[PDB]
Amino acid sequence: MAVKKIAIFGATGQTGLTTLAQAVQAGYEVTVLVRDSSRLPSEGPRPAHVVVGDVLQAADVDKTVAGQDAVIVLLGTRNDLSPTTVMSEGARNIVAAMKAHGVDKVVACTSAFLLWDPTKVPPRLQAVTDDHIRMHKVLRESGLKYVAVMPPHIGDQPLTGAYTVTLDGRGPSRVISKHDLGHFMLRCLTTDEYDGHSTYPSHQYQ
Amino acid sequence: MAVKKIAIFGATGQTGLTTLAQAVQAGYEVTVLVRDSSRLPSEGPRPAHVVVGDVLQAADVDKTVAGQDAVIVLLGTRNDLSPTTVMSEGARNIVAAMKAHGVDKVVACTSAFLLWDPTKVPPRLQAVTDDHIRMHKVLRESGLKYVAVMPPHIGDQPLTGAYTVTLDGRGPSRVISKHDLGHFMLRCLTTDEYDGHSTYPSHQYQ
Ligand SMILES: NC(=O)c1ccc[n+]([C@@H]2O[C@H](COP(=O)([O-])OP(=O)(O)OC[C@H]3O[C@@H](n4cnc5c(N)ncnc54)[C@H](OP(=O)(O)O)[C@@H]3O)[C@@H](O)[C@H]2O)c1
Ligand SMILES: NC(=O)c1ccc[n+]([C@@H]2O[C@H](COP(=O)([O-])OP(=O)(O)OC[C@H]3O[C@@H](n4cnc5c(N)ncnc54)[C@H](OP(=O)(O)O)[C@@H]3O)[C@@H](O)[C@H]2O)c1
Ligand SMILES: O=C(O)c1cc(/C=C/c2ccc(O)c(C(=O)O)c2)ccc1O
Ligand SMILES: O=C(O)c1cc(/C=C/c2ccc(O)c(C(=O)O)c2)ccc1O
């Protein structure tokens, strides 16, 4: 494995949990950053390394990024649609840590709304989308090998590995399962073909 | 009317650098106040006059404002997430220097959060937004000819010169390219129509 040690940010979240499970099964040595109050469930798969802290603390992000081959970012605000900078400021700390530690590959999830006409983004999601836009700018400007993953609705359908990946535009379906989205984040570790592109994974579950 | 000499504050910032370059290419005689001259580009368009100093030092500001026809303010304190008064104290120094040297025109950048409901502000941006509000009041109460430029997200898109400007309200998208924002800063030097108004520049970048 050319990529074997990875940091996952957001591993306790909807997509992070299945991404972690798939990564451990695939043989990755995974380091996670978890907030003190929200640890990984005791029954689930165990990462190799756990850092307890906050993506808003440069020190905690540095500890998580040190020694890795690549970074997966699945940060979010769960059900909370309020104005926030946690994703963009978290990305700022991640970029600084990758540069300091010689890590180049970052696969980071924002949203397909970054490929929408802004006048059609639902107003209830505008505040979160605003921080996705801020995040994407931070990562694009970093000069790192950045894969911008921009999914549409994240659903509960199965892992298929059969989804479409649309480059630099909206794809033909409006859903991706959380399991397939995690599968795609990990696929991006094994190829350079999506570096510098936006990617829209989607599938028809049938 | 004929503005030929301008001071730019914040010329080494994201918007400042392109405003400066555009001003020099268009023929303005530009004076900049910079804390570190190595943060100015060594190649291409270069300002006519460089004052090395700090906007918090009244004598440095006075030396920058002396002899100008108008002032552009693109100050910012990106890293401050808790109460901060750099921009508003800078604006007090600028206003005092403008009055002492007979400079009547100031075009200054705050943010579109000043046009929207306060709960739109992400918590980590509350402090900078409070100081934007303080700087806006300093400039409004000065009696100077003041164009308040209140942009949304500042993006990276190429200069278009085709953006929308809405007066005393919001408008189309929630993004303006730094290049288009700089272009609009300079357009405000050539007209009185925005004096005493708030302006919201935005555009759709396809
Ligand atoms: N739901 C959709 O249909 C959809 C569609 C497109 C895009 N998106 C975006 O896709 C991304 C992933 O969504 P998701 O549903 O998988 O994520 P999620 O369930 O909202 O999980 C968010 C993850 O980020 C962690 N996190 C939040 N703040 C943190 C902080 N300060 N420090 C460290 N970790 C922090 C959370 O940890 P905790 O356990 O401590 O909370 C959690 O692990 C999000 O950005 C979302 O906006 C979602
Ligand atoms: N999407 C956005 O980022 C956004 C959106 C809406 C509004 N705004 C606001 O737009 C304005 C311009 O934003 P920007 O991103 O273009 O600015 P920026 O890149 O953060 O640049 C800030 C400028 O102000 C200078 N500065 C800071 N403190 C100074 C001091 N004590 N003395 C002299 N100069 C000082 C900086 O000089 P140094 O190079 O020496 O640091 C730099 O030139 C800001 O006020 C910002 O809050 C930004
Ligand atoms: O909390 C949430 O629910 C949430 C939802 C989103 C939805 C993103 C999206 C983009 C493009 C799409 O086409 C569709 C669709 O079609 O369903 C959905 C983004 C961020 C979120 O935090
Ligand atoms: O530190 C920073 O980077 C910073 C960023 C800002 C951004 C303010 C703003 C206003 C209206 C907006 O719509 C949006 C958007 O859409 O992203 C953003 C302000 C002050 C800052 O110091």
Author numbering:
A (entry chain A), B (entry chain B): 1 to 206
Reproduce, without paraphrasing, sentences from the article in which this PDB structure was first reported.
Biliverdin IXβ reductase (BLVRB) has emerged as a promising therapeutic target for thrombocytopenia due to its involvement in reactive oxygen species (ROS) mechanisms. In the pathway of heme degradation, BLVRB utilizes NAD(P)H downstream of heme oxygenase(s)-1 (inducible HMOX1) and -2 (constitutive HMOX2) to reduce biliverdin (BV)-IXβ to bilirubin (BR)-IXβ. Consequently, the BV/BR redox cycle, under the control of BLVRB, plays a crucial role in regulating reactive oxygen species (ROS). A large-scale transcriptomic analysis on essential and reactive thrombocytosis cohorts identified biliverdin IXβ reductase (BLVRB) as a regulator of platelet production through MK differentiation by controlling reactive oxygen species (ROS).
To this end, we devised a new chemical scheme to replace the diazenyl bond of olsalazine with an alkene bond, resulting in the creation of olsalkene (OSK). The crystal structures of BLVRB bound to NADP+ and OSK were resolved at a resolution of 1.7 Å. The crystals belong to space group P21212, with each crystal asymmetric unit containing two BLVRB molecules (designated as Mol-A and -B). Notably, a specific region of BLVRB, situated within the vicinity of crystal contacts, exhibits considerable disparity between Mol-A and Mol-B. Particularly, the structures of drug-binding pockets display distinctions between Mol-A and Mol-B. While the OSK-binding pocket structure in Mol-B is influenced by the presence of the second BLVRB molecule due to crystal contacts, the structure of the OSK-binding pocket in Mol-A remains intact in a monomeric state of BLVRB. Consequently, detailed structural analyses of the complex were focused on Mol-A. The binding site of OSK closely associates with the nicotinamide moiety of the NADP+ cofactor, where the xanthene ring of FMN adopts a similar orientation to xanthene-based inhibitors like phloxine B and erythrosine, as evidenced by NMR titration experiments. A primary driving force for the binding of OSK is the ring-stacking interaction between the nicotinamide moiety of NADP+ and OSK, along with hydrophobic interactions involving residues S111, F113, W116, L125, V128, P152, and H153. Additionally, favorable interactions are facilitated by positively charged residues R78, K120, R124, R170, and K178. Notably, OSK displaces the sidechain of W116 (as observed in the FMN complex) and shifts it toward the binding pocket by approximately 2.5 Å. OSK exhibited high affinity and specific binding to the substrate binding pocket of BLVRB with a KD of 0.140 µM, akin to the previously studied OSA.
